[PDB]
Amino acid sequence: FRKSNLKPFERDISTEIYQAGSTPCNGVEGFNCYFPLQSYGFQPTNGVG
Amino acid sequence: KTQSLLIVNNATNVVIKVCEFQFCNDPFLGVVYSSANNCTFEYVSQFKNLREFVFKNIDGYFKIYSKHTPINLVRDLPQGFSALEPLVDLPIGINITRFQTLLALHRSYLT
Numbered sequence: 001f002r003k004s005n006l007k008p009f010e011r012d013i014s015t016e017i018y019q020a021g022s023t024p025c026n027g028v029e030g031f032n033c034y035f036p037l038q039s040y041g042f043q044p045t046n047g048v049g
Numbered sequence: 050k051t052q053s054l055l056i057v058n059n060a061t062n063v064v065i066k067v068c069e070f071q072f073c074n075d076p077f078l079g080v081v082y083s084s085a086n087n088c089t090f091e092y093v094s095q096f097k098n099l100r101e102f103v104f105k106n107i108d109g110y111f112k113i114y115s116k117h118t119p120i121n122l123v124r125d126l127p128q129g130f131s132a133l134e135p136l137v138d139l140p141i142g143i144n145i146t147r148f149q150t151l152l153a154l155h156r157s158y159l160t
């Protein structure tokens with residue numbers, strides 16, 4: 001999840017909560033709120049892609 | 050919370066770091082401070098004075114242009130013409146929206 005797009009060759013390292021509504025998020029993912037990073041699922045029993 | 054840049058002269062070399070700093074309210078150097086957490090880039094290299102600088106931030110690069118000249122006027126900027134050569138082309142890759150100057154002070158109030 002990200003607010004706006006990126007410019008060329010600039011990176012984003014900021015582990016802070018990003019709100020998807022007018023209600024505030026303060027460290028807690030409760031009121032229609034998520035974490036801006038979620039990991040992968042790399043299993044050997046998968047197809048290509 | 051986001052990454053910052055810092056250029057510091059110690060009267061013998063140049064320190065350039067892109068670490069995550071939690072700053073003061075008035076930072077300075079006592080005739081000193083730079084925090085450190087989770088960085089990428091680090092660089093080390095080498096009134097009648099007048100030094101001029103130009104900073105640009107385009108396409109993930111940080112352009113710096115420089116020129117020094119001996120002025121001998123009182124309190125203004127001169128009138129002639131002199132062009133500024135390129136200095137360095139650092140690949141820092143951050144977002145820069147504000148800036149602030151670091152002077153040499155005495156009263157070591159670290160806020």
Ligand SMILES: *[C@@H]1O[C@H](CO)[C@@H](O[C@@H]2O[C@H](CO)[C@@H](O)[C@H](O)[C@H]2NC(C)=O)[C@H](O)[C@H]1NC(C)=O
Pocket residue numbers: 003004005006007144145146
């Ligand atoms: C670089 O930083 C600036 C300042 O933090 C960001 O500008 C903000 O953008 C949001 C929308 O994305 C606005 O709601 C704010 O008002 C802006 N703040 C200021 C001070 O202008 C900018 O988005 C950042 N760059 C990128 C690519 O995200």
Ligand SMILES: *[C@@H]1O[C@H](CO)[C@@H](O)[C@H](O)[C@H]1NC(C)=O
Pocket residue numbers: 059060061062064
């Ligand atoms: C900056 O200069 C001081 C002079 O006392 C020196 O001790 C220090 O090592 C220099 N900084 C770096 C990063 O080398």
Ligand SMILES: *[C@@H]1O[C@H](CO)[C@@H](O)[C@H](O)[C@H]1NC(C)=O
Pocket residue numbers: 013015069086087
């Ligand atoms: C920087 O990385 C270390 C280990 O990789 C981690 O413990 C720390 O939280 C990170 N700091 C950030 C992302 O500000």
